[PDB]
Amino acid sequence: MLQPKRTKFRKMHKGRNRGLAQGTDVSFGSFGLKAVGRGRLTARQIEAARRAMTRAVKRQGKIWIRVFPDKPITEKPLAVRMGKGKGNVEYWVALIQPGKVLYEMDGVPEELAREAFKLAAAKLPIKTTFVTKTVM
Amino acid sequence: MFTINAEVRKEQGKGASRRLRAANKFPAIIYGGKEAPLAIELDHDKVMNMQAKAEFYSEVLTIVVDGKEIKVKAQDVQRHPYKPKLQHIDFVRA
Amino acid sequence: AKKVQAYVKLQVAAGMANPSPPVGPALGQQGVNIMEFCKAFNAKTDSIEKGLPIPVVITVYADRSFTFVTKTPPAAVLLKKAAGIKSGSGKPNKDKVGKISRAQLQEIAQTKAADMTGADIEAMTRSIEGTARSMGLVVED
Amino acid sequence: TGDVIGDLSRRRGMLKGQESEVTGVKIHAEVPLSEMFGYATQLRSLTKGRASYTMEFLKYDEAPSNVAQAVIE
Amino acid sequence: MKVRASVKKLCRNCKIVKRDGVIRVICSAEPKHKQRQG
């Protein structure tokens, strides 16, 4: 799974997840998967989403991943009272905003591109949509 | 060869613009020349239906306003984030 | 001359008048007593030489009399030896062997004419130069 | 006939040709000895007891990759 | 019958109808394709 090699700190404050997103246009290939909801994506769902749609074309075309987990979400161990320090980091998420370009790919025909993204989307906890590169 | 129906908008602002796009119409701006810019309002539905063509971005766009029709070019499209609509277009008066 | 119930459209070898592996299914299906049928087969079998495949149509009348209108080499099997080799395919676009002319095939289209009268002399030759394409053979004149 | 042959092919059988006499449809084929095991128990299970067969030897022909790898103990 | 909360038209002849308010899919050819509750 995807994870930051050598980041500065061990833990990070929780932080609200407001506003909109910056990645909006299908900037690399031709067919992308823009997100419509507002949540967060851990690395395991990041790995699983690509895997399902990589084997949907089985080799075909280039596939770009536009989101990377930065936020080191922690969890406390069970039967441990509150306080006593911040818990250890268990998994890494990437906070998703509305109108964010997720997984993007190229080199595939359109009808199976919408099919491959449909196989990927059901693995996501965010409602997404299938978007296409416009000019400019 | 596309033609645009439009008119001059008044009383602009943040909430004013938000009031527009919840009424199937959206604002814009026309600038470029030895004159003042023109904050022009134009129909949302019509131009969104025709932005799919490549000639919407590679042609001297014929926007008519108060009878006076001008030839402009499309600079940028500030579109809506996740809804398939759009928020603003910049028309440089070429 | 009935319908398709007893109508079998296949055969391979003239000289081998005995039920061959592909004519097996064909024969057994309609209980064809090939032995006396071989004597009727060998009236026209002797007119053609061996080495070029021959099909047959089979017609069984209502009163157990069963007859046939046999053939001469049709579309595929004649164009193959015209190229010199019976096979060499599985890769039409991926292989390129030989170049054959249509004027020489205009003569053998007339031999297919008395055999399997396929429409429009050159357009059947075009139908069958695609069987050459399907056999991985190039054709140019 | 078709059923017997489908099952011949199934037991790695070479259906070959479909001959015919008067009341019967005779089909001769080549079958491995390893898949001969209990054949008439499976023959008349598919032919309502109205069929028969007789096994004869031809040759120790080729054993394919799945059949060659099996018996190696 | 499969009580699947999602129902997909699994074939060509599989038709989707609303019996008693409940969405039901039936098939003329394959009785394994019958399902409801979607």
Add this chain to the structure above:
RNA sequence: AGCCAGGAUGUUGGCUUAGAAGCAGCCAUCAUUUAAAGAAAGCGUAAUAGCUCACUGGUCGAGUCGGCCUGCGCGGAAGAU
């Protein structure tokens, strides 16, 4: 969309030909008219035949097919006096 005529198939086309006969799937993707016909999806099947499907030849005679953006509803929905 149906109803009758049908399916306009050269080509049993290679191949692997034991058959893969559009109907194993790799492939050429040729061509016949250029009024109804892809060298082909699908169960069915050993393989043809097959009924169909794509397409309606003509019968009737009017509106119709599927997505898009959304308003409000259904199902998803099982707990203990």
